[PDB]
Amino acid sequence: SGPVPSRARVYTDVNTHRPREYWDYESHVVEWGNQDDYQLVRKLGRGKYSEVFEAINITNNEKVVVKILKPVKKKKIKREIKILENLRGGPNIITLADIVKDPVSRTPALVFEHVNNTDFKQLYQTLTDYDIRFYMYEILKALDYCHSMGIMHRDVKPHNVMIDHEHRKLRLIDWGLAEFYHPGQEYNVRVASRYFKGPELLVDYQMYDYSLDMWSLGCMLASMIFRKEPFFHGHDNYDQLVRIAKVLGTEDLYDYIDKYNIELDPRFNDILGRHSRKRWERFVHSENQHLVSPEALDFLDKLLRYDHQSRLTAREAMEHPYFYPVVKE
Ligand SMILES: Nc1ncnc2c1ncn2[C@@H]1O[C@H](COP(=O)(O)OP(=O)(O)NP(=O)(O)O)[C@@H](O)[C@H]1O
Ligand SMILES: [Cl-]
Ligand SMILES: [Mg+2]
Ligand SMILES: [Mg+2]
């Protein structure tokens, strides 16, 4: 029969109305600087795609961050570069300062504006009800901007959100999985972290859109207000959907699959079963009560939906009552 097609509710055709060069990143030509302008101070951690260092720009003694890219396809490098260049100047978006190459190993490296992020492992337990609202609103600014620019982040999670609590600055980072949205394109579903993967990724629905980022944001919010990280703690991609099913119920899930005529992997058959949609009060207790409110739960409910078309858009979210104390200030 074949899966039912899907289009984005908002910002659907923004890339079509732009010059080819804007989104055709394969044909983008990179202008390199010299990595001798920078000296590495210390490593700030690693990943599967890069090693990240704090560094100094010897030309003006300013602190920067160098992200040396582990050998991936040139395409994926040009993509991250083109997207960062397109998103430059945007609200709460990380700034790409320069692009360099090691003279010896010819390994490409990205230079970013420095951000002094206090670790979320120690931060998300020191945040007040307002702070959560405030920073969530900041991320939404970033998401709305990049979506309006025709870009899906596809990797929204606490590790990719750098926060300077002292100056109350927030920067969304890691755009290595980011991609341009085109109506009717079927994307790779194997992106983002397991705990933040949307249902469309778990059931292998390729024609997704910006709303994927909104699910991930809901997962973040849930873990923050309930003090449960991660909120959906699955053992793998299949048990991850099961973990979700025990909360959002199985009824809406099977309706979602039916609406888009999704072919569900035979492996899910025996492991999903039947589960009711739980009320959010179940996850509330004395430890997190001060962060939970009727508005917080109403907002959270509108992000965590199986149907990606049924989730709030970034702009809609910013207009939710949950952010009234932030907008008033
Ligand atoms: N601009 C920055 N300023 C300060 N620290 C940063 C900056 N960018 C990245 N980091 C740190 O480096 C880590 C990983 O950087 P990241 O850009 O996500 O590379 P990555 O390989 O794409 N990570 P991931 O794809 O999620 O496995 C982050 O968790 C931060 O701690
Ligand atoms: Cl149950
Ligand atoms: Mg990252
Ligand atoms: Mg990455």
What is the SS3 assignment for 260? Answer: coil
Identity of the amino acid at 132: I
Residue 326 CB less than 6 A away from ligand 1:
no
From 36, 102, 119, 155, active-site residue: 155
Domain that holds residue 301: 6-23+115-329
Residues 45 and 83 in one domain: yes
Residue type at 146?
A: C
Point out the domain boundary residue: 94, 114, 134: 114
Domain tally, the chain: 2
> Do 12 and 32 reside in the same domain of the chain?
no
Instruction: Give dist(CA 8, CA 179) in Å, integer.
Output: 14
Is the shortest distance between the CB of 66 and ligand 1 below 6 Å?
Answer: no
CATH of the domain at 60: 3.30.200.20
Q: What is the DSSP string of 4-40?
A: PP---SSSTTTTTTS-HHHH-GGGPPPPP--GGGEEE
Q: Are residues 132 and 251 in the same domain?
A: yes
Per DSSP bridges, beta strands 38-46 and 50-57 are: antiparallel
Report every protein residue that has its C-beta within 5 angstroms of ion ligand 4: 174, 176
Triad 288, 294, 300: Cα angle to 5°: 80
Strand partners, 56: 39, 63
Render 139-193 in DSSP notation, one character per residue: HHHHHHHHHHTTEE----SGGGEEEETTTTEEEE---SS-EE--TT----S--S-
What is the per-residue burial (b if ≥16 Cβ within 10 Å, else e) of 161-198? bbbeeeeeebbbbbbbbbbbbbeeeebebebbbbbbbb
Statement to judge: residues 305 and 159 lie in one domain: yes
Q: How far apart are CA 170 and CA 238, in angstroms?
A: 33
- Does the C-beta of 45 come closer than 6 Å to ligand 1? yes
Name the domain boundary from 91, 114, 137. 114
Residue with structure tokens 């025709």?
150
Q: Is residue 269 part of a domain?
A: yes
Q: Which two tokens stand for residue 112?
A: 């970013």
Whether residue 289 lies inside any domain: the answer is yes
User: Is the domain of 80 the same as that of 110?
Assistant: yes
Q: How many Å apart are CA 109 and CA 316, to the nearest integer?
A: 37
Amino acid of residue 287: E
User: What is the C-alpha end-to-end distance of the chain, expressed in Å?
Assistant: 52
CB 66 within 8 A of CB 40: yes
